[PDB]
Design a protein around this ligand. Sequence first.
Ligand SMILES: [Au+]
Ligand SMILES: [Au+]
Ligand SMILES: [Au+]
Ligand SMILES: [Au+]
Ligand SMILES: [Au+]
Ligand SMILES: [Au+]
Ligand SMILES: [Au+]
Ligand SMILES: [Au+]
Ligand SMILES: [Au+]
Ligand SMILES: [Au+]
Ligand SMILES: [Au+]
Lengths: 55, 55, 55, 55, 55, 55, 55, 55, 55, 55, 55, 55, 55, 55, 55, 55, 55, 55, 55, 55, 55
Amino acid sequence: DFVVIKALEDGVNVIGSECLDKGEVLIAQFTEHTSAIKVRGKAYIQTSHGVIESE
Amino acid sequence: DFVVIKALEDGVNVIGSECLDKGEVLIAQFTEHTSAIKVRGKAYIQTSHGVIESE
Amino acid sequence: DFVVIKALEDGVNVIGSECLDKGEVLIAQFTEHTSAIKVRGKAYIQTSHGVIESE
Amino acid sequence: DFVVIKALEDGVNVIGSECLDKGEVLIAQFTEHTSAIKVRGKAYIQTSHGVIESE
Amino acid sequence: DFVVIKALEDGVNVIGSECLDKGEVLIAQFTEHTSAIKVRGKAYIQTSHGVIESE
Amino acid sequence: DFVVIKALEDGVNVIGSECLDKGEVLIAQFTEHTSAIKVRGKAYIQTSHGVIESE
Amino acid sequence: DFVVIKALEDGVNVIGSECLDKGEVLIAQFTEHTSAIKVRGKAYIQTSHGVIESE
Amino acid sequence: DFVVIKALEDGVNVIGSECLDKGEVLIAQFTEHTSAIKVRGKAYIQTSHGVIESE
Amino acid sequence: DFVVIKALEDGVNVIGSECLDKGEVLIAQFTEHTSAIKVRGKAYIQTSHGVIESE
Amino acid sequence: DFVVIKALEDGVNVIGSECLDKGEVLIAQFTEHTSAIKVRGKAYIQTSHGVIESE
Amino acid sequence: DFVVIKALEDGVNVIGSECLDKGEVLIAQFTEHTSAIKVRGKAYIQTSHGVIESE
Amino acid sequence: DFVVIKALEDGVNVIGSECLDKGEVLIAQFTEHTSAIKVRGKAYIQTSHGVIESE
Amino acid sequence: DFVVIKALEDGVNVIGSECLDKGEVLIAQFTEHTSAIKVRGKAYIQTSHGVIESE
Amino acid sequence: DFVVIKALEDGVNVIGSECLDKGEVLIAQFTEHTSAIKVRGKAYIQTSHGVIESE
Amino acid sequence: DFVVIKALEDGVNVIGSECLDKGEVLIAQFTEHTSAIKVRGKAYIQTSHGVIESE
Amino acid sequence: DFVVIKALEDGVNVIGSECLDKGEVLIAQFTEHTSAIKVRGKAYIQTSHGVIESE
Amino acid sequence: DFVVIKALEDGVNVIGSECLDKGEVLIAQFTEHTSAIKVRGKAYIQTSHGVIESE
Amino acid sequence: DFVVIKALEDGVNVIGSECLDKGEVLIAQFTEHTSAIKVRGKAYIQTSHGVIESE
Amino acid sequence: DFVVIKALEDGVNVIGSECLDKGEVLIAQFTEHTSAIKVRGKAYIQTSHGVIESE
Amino acid sequence: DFVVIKALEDGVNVIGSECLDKGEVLIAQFTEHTSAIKVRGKAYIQTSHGVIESE
Amino acid sequence: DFVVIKALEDGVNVIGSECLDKGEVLIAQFTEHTSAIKVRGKAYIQTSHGVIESE
Ligand SMILES: [Au+]
Ligand SMILES: [Au+]
Ligand SMILES: [Au+]
Ligand SMILES: [Au+]
Ligand SMILES: [Au+]
Ligand SMILES: [Au+]
Ligand SMILES: [Au+]
Ligand SMILES: [Au+]
Ligand SMILES: [Au+]
Ligand SMILES: [Au+]
Ligand SMILES: [Au+]
C-alpha cells in the first residue's frame, strides 16, 4: 500500500530522509528497503486505517 | 494503484519531474521506478485513502 | 484498472497522444508503457477513486 | 473486467473497428491487444465505475 | 466472469453465432476465443455491472 | 463460479444435455468444456448477478 | 466453494450418487470430478448465492 | 474454508468417522481427502453460507 | 436378451441416461457396459419373464 | 434376434435413423453397432416377448 | 433365422434392392451385410414371431 | 450442375436418403458419390432441362 | 450431362438395373461406367435435346 | 454456381446451419463441403434454373 | 455428347450390337470405343443437331 | 462470378464484415475464403440470376 | 471479368484507393489482390450483370 | 478480353501512360501488369459490356 | 481474338509498324508481343465489340 | 530543396499520386525517387525560383 | 531546412500525424522519413521561399 502525508508546516522530516515544506504532499509506497516511516513535525497523514495528525 | 491530481493553478510540479497547468488532470500509476510522488503548489489529489488538497 | 474519459468539448488531448472530439468517450487501460495519463481541456473523468472534471 | 455498450442510435463505432446498430448491446472484455476502447456517437456505457453516455 | 441473457422475443442472436427463442436463458462465460459478445433483438442482460435491455 | 437451476416444470433441458423434472435443483459449476449453459422451459435460476426466471 | 444440503425428507438423492435420510446435512465441496450436483426430493440448499428449496 | 459443528445431543456422527458428545464443538477444515462432510443426529452447523440445524 | 419399454407418460427416464416421451417404445439389448437398467415414471415393460408396469 | 416394425402411419422414425411410410414393414436384426432401437410415432412392433403398439 | 415374403401384388420391393412380382415367394436369410429388411407394397410376411401383412 | 426440389407434400424422400416436409426446398449438387437421384411422392423439380412434377 | 426420367406407370426399368414405380422421377448423370441408358415401359424423358416418351 | 435466398419471414434455416431474419438475402456458392442446401420456412430462392418459393 | 433413340418398331438394331423393341428408348453416350453409331429399322433419333427418322 | 450491391440506405452490412453508406456500390467477387455473402438492411443486389431487393 | 466506372462528378473514390474526376472512365479488371471494389460518390457503373448508378 | 478506345479529341491519355490524337483508335488487351485502365478527355470506348463516352 | 481493319484511304499505319493502301484488309490476331494496336488515318475496324471508324 | 503547393481548389493532383482539397498546403521535398512533380488543377506554387500559378 | 507552422485555429493537423491548438507554433525539420508535410485547416506557414496561409 501507500501513505499520504500533507505537510502542514515547514521542515517536516520523513525518514525512510526527505524534507517537506508547508503545503506539499508526499505519497509514499512501501518497498523492500522502506519498512518503516517516521514522521516529525506537524503533518496530516492518511493511511488505509484512516487519518492521523502528527505534531 | 494510482493517484489522480487535478492542478488547480498553473505550474504544479509532480516529482516522480512533470509540470501541469491549471485545469489539467494527471492520473499516475506506481511503478518500480516511481516509489514516491511529491506534489507542489495548489492541487487537488484523489487517492484510495480519500481526497486531499496540496498548497 | 482503467479510466473513463468523456470529452465535454472538442480537441481534448490524452497523453499516454490521442485527441477526442465533443461527446466521445475513451476507456483506457493501464499497460507497462502507459504509466501516466495527462488530460487537457474540458473533460469528465471517472476512475475507481471517483469522478473528476478536468478543464 | 468488461464494459457494456448499448447503442442508442445507428452506426455507433467501437474502436479496439466494430459497428453497432440501434438497440444492440456489445459486452467487451479487455485483452492484451485491446488496451483502449473509443466510442463514437450516441451510446450508453456501463463500466465498473458506473454509467456514462457518449454522444 | 459471465453474463446472463434472457431472450424476451424469438430469434435473438448472440455473436461470440447462437440463436435463442423466447423464454430461454443463456449463461455465457468469457474465454480466450470469446472476447466480445454482441446481442441483437429484444433481450434482457444481467452482468456484474447491473442489468440492461437490448432491443 | 456456479449456477443454481430449480426446475419449476417437468422436462427442463440444460445444455452444456441434461433433463430435469419438476422440483429438482441442479447446481452446475463452469469447467473448461462447459463455457455456455442454455436453459429451456420454465425454471428459476440463481447466479452471482442475481436471480432470473426462464420460460 | 461448497454447498449445504439439509434433507427435509427421507431418501434424498444427491448426484455427483449418495442418499440422505431426513434430518441429515451434507456439506459438499466442488472438485475436478464433481462439476455438477443434482438434488432430488424435498431438501433445503444453502449456497453462496443464497438459499433454495428443492422438491 | 471450515465449518463449525456444535453437537446438541450425544453420539453425533461426522463422516469425512468421528463421534461427538453433547456440548462439544468440532471446527473442521476441508482438505484434499475430505471433500464431503455428512452430519447425523441433532447438531448445529455454522458455515460461511450461514447456520443450519441437522436432526 | 432384450427388454421392451413402452413409455406411457412423458419424461420416462431409462438409466443404462435416455429419456422417452409418451407413446414411444425403446427396445434395449444388454451389453457388457449395460449390466443394469433402471426405469422411472409410468412405463410398461415386457421382458422374457413377462410384463410389468413401472410407476 | 430381430424385431418386426409395421408402420401404421407415415413418417415413423426408427433410430439405431431410418424413416418408414404407412404400410411398410422393417425387420431389424441386432448387431454390435445397433444395441438399442427407439421407435417414434404410431407403429406396431412384434418381438420375441410379444407384440406392442408404439404411439 | 430367415423370413418368408409372399408378394401379393406386382412390384414389391425388398431392400437389403430386389423386386418381386405377384405370386412369387422370397425366403431371405440374415447375413452380416443384411441387418435390416424393408418391405414395400402389398406382401405377406412370415417370421419366427408370426405373420404380418405389409401394404 | 444442381437440381432444385420443392416438396409439395410431407414425407418426400430423396435418395442419393433424405426426407423433406411440405414447403421445404432442397438444392442438390452432383458429386462423385451421388450419380443418381430418385424422388418419391409429390414434388416439383427444376433442372437445367426444365421443370417436372413427380408424384 | 444428365437425364430426367418420370415413370408414368409402375415397373419402369432403367438399365445402366433400377426399377421405378408410377410417379417417381430419377435424375441420372452419366459416368464412366454408365455409357448407355435403356428405358423400358411407359416413361417421360427429358434430355438436353428435348423431351421424349418411351412406351 | 450460386443461389440467392431472400428470407421472407424470420428464422429461416439454411443447412449446408445458418439462420436468417426477415428481409435478409444470402448468396451462397457451392463448395466441396457444401454439396446440398436445404431451405426451411418461407423464403424466395433464385437459382440458374429460375425462381422458387419455399414454405 | 449423347443421342436419344426411340425405337418405333420391333427389332431395331443399334451398332456401336444392341437390339431394341417397340417403345423403348436408348440414350447413348460417345466413348473412345464407340466412334460411330449405325441405326437400322424404323426409329426416331434426337441429337444435338435436331431430330431425324431412320427407316 | 461477382455480385453488385447498391446500398439504398445507410449502415448496410455485408458479411463475407464491411459496412456501406447510402448511395455506395460494392462489387464483390467470390474467393476461396468468401463462400457466402449475407446482406442486411435495405439494398439492391444484381447477380447473374437477376436482381433482388434486400430489406 | 472487368467493370467500367464513369465518374459523373469530381472526386469519385474507387477502393481496391484511386480517385477520378468528372468525365473520366476507369476500366478495372479483377486480380488476386483486388477481390472487392467499393465506389463512392456519383458514378455510373457497367458490369456484366448490367448497369447501376452509385451516389 | 480487350477494349477499343477511339480518341475523339487530341491529347487523350490512357493510363495502364500512352497518349492519342484525334481520330486514332487503340485496341488494348488486359495483361498481368495492366489490371486497370483509366481514360481521360473526350473518347469513345467499346467494351464487352457495351459502349460509353468518356469526357 | 482478332480484329479486321479495312483501309479506306492510302497510307494507313497499323502499329503493333505495317502500312496499308486503300482497299486492303488486314486481319490481325493478338499475340504475346502484340498487346496493343494503334490505327492511324481513315480506316474501318471490325472487332468483337462491333464496328468503328478511325480517322 | 522543396516546393510549397497551396491548393486553391478541390481535387488538386500532385504526381510524384496525392490529392489535395481546397485550402490545404503540401510542402514536398525532392528525393531519389521523386525526380519530377506534376501539378494539375488550380494551385499556387512557391519554389526557390519564385511563385507560379497552375491551372 | 525547416518550416514554421503557426496554428491560427484549433485542431490543425500536420501529416508527416500531429495536431496543434490555436496559438501554438511547430518548427519542423525534414528527415529521411519525413519527405512531405501536408497542413490542414487554418494555419500560417513560413518557409525559406516565403510565407503562405493554409485554410
Ligand atoms: Au529540512
Ligand atoms: Au487534436
Ligand atoms: Au435464428
Ligand atoms: Au436411498
Ligand atoms: Au427428459
Ligand atoms: Au420392380
Ligand atoms: Au421421412
Ligand atoms: Au434383335
Ligand atoms: Au456500420
Ligand atoms: Au499528350
Ligand atoms: Au482526389
